[PDB]
Design a protein around this ligand. Structure first.
Ligand SMILES: [Zn+2]
Length: 132
DNA sequence: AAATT
DNA sequence: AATTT
DNA sequence: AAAGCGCAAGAT
DNA sequence: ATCTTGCGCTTT
């Protein structure tokens, strides 16, 4: 596709576009993912690169808000829950804090993601395991 | 606070 | 220096 | 004592 | 502007 279509993805801050490409702003020398929450730049200052690597190669450093140099969190986050599920499969109660420490996530994110991935809270999951 | 104007 | 997210 | 929950407050 | 954390209160 052309860059104008890519541009519309950016103005739309469309997450579906993340990974597909990365845009760079010559006035800042920073590159971001299409869904970056940062105010947008003027079209004339933007350019696109198929991926971070190429961006770096071109002298642009990653944005500190969208971390466009790291791959899609998707899997990473999924790996987090799975591990938490296993740590909860024991009679002795595990607090969200001890759990968060273990999977290395702010208790807020862990709790939100867990209920999002499993469908219940870490607490319930441990109770369910005990149950059956 | 960090990006962009 | 001021705006914008 | 810890989980949950809505909202103020802090951070990016 | 948008998202995360801290708080006080009720429920587990
Ligand atoms: Zn960014």
């Amino acid at each position: 596709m052309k860059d104008d279509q890519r541009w519309q993805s950016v103005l739309a801050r469309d997450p579906n576009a993340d990974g597909e490409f990365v845009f760079a702003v010559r006035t800042t020398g920073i590159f971001c993912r299409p869904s970056c929450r940062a105010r947008h730049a003027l079209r004339e200052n933007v350019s696109f690169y198929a991926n971070a690597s190429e961006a770096l190669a071109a002298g642009f450093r990653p944005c500190k808000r969208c971390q466009p140099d790291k791959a899609n969190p998707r899997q990473h986050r999924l790996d987090k829950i799975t591990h938490a599920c296993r740590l909860l499969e024991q009679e002795t109660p595990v607090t969200l804090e001890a759990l968060a420490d273990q999977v290395a996530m702010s208790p807020f994110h862990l709790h939100r993601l867990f209920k999002a991935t499993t469908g219940m809270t870490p607490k319930a999951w441990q109770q369910a395991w005990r149950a059956r």
